[PDB]
Amino acid sequence: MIFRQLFDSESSTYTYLIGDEATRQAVLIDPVLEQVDRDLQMVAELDLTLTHVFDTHVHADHITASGALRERTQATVVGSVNGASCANVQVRHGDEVRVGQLVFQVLATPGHTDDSISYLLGDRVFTGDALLVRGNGRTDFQNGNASQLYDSLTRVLFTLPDETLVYPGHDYKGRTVTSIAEEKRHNPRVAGKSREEFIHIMENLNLPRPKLIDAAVPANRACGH
Amino acid sequence: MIFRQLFDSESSTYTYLIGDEATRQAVLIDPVLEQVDRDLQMVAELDLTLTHVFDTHVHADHITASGALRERTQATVVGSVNGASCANVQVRHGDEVRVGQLVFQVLATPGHTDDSISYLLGDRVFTGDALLVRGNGRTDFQNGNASQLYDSLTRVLFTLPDETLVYPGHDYKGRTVTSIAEEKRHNPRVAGKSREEFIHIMENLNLPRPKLIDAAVPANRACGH
Ligand SMILES: [Fe+3]
Numbered sequence: 001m002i003f004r005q006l007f008d009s010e011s012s013t014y015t016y017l018i019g020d021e022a023t024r025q026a027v028l029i030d031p032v033l034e035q036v037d038r039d040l041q042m043v044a045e046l047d048l049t050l051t052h053v054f055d056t057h058v059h060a061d062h063i064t065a066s067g068a069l070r071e072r073t074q075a076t077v078v079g080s081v082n083g084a085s086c087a088n089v090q091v092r093h094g095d096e097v098r099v100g101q102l103v104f105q106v107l108a109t110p111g112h113t114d115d116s117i118s119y120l121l122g123d124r125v126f127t128g129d130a131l132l133v134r135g136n137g138r139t140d141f142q143n144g145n146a147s148q149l150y151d152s153l154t155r156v157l158f159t160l161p162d163e164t165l166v167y168p169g170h171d172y173k174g175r176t177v178t179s180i181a182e183e184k185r186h187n188p189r190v191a192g193k194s195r196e197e198f199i200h201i202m203e204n205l206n207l208p209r210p211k212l213i214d215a216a217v218p219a220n221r222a223c224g225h
Numbered sequence: 226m227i228f229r230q231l232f233d234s235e236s237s238t239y240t241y242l243i244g245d246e247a248t249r250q251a252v253l254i255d256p257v258l259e260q261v262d263r264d265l266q267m268v269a270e271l272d273l274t275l276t277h278v279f280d281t282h283v284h285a286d287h288i289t290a291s292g293a294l295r296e297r298t299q300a301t302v303v304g305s306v307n308g309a310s311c312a313n314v315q316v317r318h319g320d321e322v323r324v325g326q327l328v329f330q331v332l333a334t335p336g337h338t339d340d341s342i343s344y345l346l347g348d349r350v351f352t353g354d355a356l357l358v359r360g361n362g363r364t365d366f367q368n369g370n371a372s373q374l375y376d377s378l379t380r381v382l383f384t385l386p387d388e389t390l391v392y393p394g395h396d397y398k399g400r401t402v403t404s405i406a407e408e409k410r411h412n413p414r415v416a417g418k419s420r421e422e423f424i425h426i427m428e429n430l431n432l433p434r435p436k437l438i439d440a441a442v443p444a445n446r447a448c449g450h
């Protein structure tokens with residue numbers, strides 16, 4: 001497996017490039033529109049071919065590049081059934097997405113948004129804004145739900161093996177990766193917290209409205225158009 | 226081996242945490258003073274003990290945390306013989322630094338600075354500002370020399386195995402890692418460039434002086450004191 005983590009300073013978004021060493025097929029997870037040239041340049045120079053693009057959820061902080069990438073490489077766009085309608089492959093819990101020899105298992109992890117999903121790839125999982133490094137995404141927009149996010153964290157993600165690496169969709173403090181074992185112990189909002197305790201925290205976070213939410217959400221519904 | 230890459234947005238500096246699974250000894254490479262609490266919290270939560278702190282070179286963009294870390298954990302500060310005098314272990318080309326059962330081989334890679342070195346750990350090398358992702362550090366300050374840097378890249382670093390991962394001290398475009406094979410083929414300043422060609426490029430880069438060099442350099446020669 002060929003693995004590359006990409007960072008977009010503007011939105012603090014993590015883009016993930018996973019390549020299959022057999023078929024040389026590559027997939028970009030949560031790519032950013034402004035970073036299209038960077039991403040494609042990395043794919044080519046690593047001697048891979050972009051055949052898939054995954055979106056963990058409809059983003060409100062950046063414009064997805066899935067649409068722009070599909071125009072350039074004819075890659076398959078994958079998303080939640082509750083996500084962008086123009087996505088070629090719409091997946092739900094239990095589904096699998098084949099990227100060459102790579103088999104991604106789809107995990108439904110709503111809470112941040114109702115269309116939020118996670119991609120399990122063996123020893124690692126890409127969780128988007130559901131599970132972050134020592135935190136989690138907000139639940140006050142995009143039909144978010146604190147109670148639902150608690151289920152996605154404790155029952156869906158935390159049941160994964162301890163050594164499983166967690167690659168989040170964002171980080172604002174310079175952390176690049178965490179693990180399930182780490183979060184089951186040191187997550188300030190979930191570890192030692194009940195559902196009601198977790199709900200009370202999220203409902204009273206008092207955070208400013210997402211900067212690009214009124215622009216990004218409609219655009220990302222159309223795969224960034 | 227426990228590996229964690231940390232990013233400091235203010236200086237675009239990459240800090241590297243390498244932990245030994247056997248002895249639980251950990252080392253921080255190029256730690257940032259403003260990120261001391263973050264770094265130590267990561268070391269503890271990963272069940273490790275900071276015993277060593279490496280610095281690739283005297284930095285001109287941020288204050289090193291080696292001194293402050295030495296105050297808290299009594300960690301061994303390692304640096305070049307031309308680096309900070311208050312460093313406990315001063316190394317040169319050919320030397321080895323052992324962090325538990327981890328064996329770091331020291332590679333002398335001047336050019337950016339006269340005290341710039343690289344740490345080889347098996348399948349990966351930490352190059353500081355000598356070799357960057359699709360680039361290299363500037364050679365017009367703190368005893369920098371384009372001729373030396375060309376030699377450090379082509380004769381010292383590029384002779385390492387192709388599959389060797391390269392973890393740079395900085396990146397300003399969101400790239401986290403490259404490899405020797407990639408840079409031998411796609412480095413815009415060295416690939417297909419002679420020594421004289423490379424020198425003339427660096428001689429006329431026309432860059433603004435690092436707006437911290439007058440504060441950071443003398444401070445980092447005192448290990449961030
Ligand atoms: Fe989000």
Ligand SMILES: [Fe+3]
Pocket residue numbers: 282283284285337354362
């Ligand atoms: Fe430097």
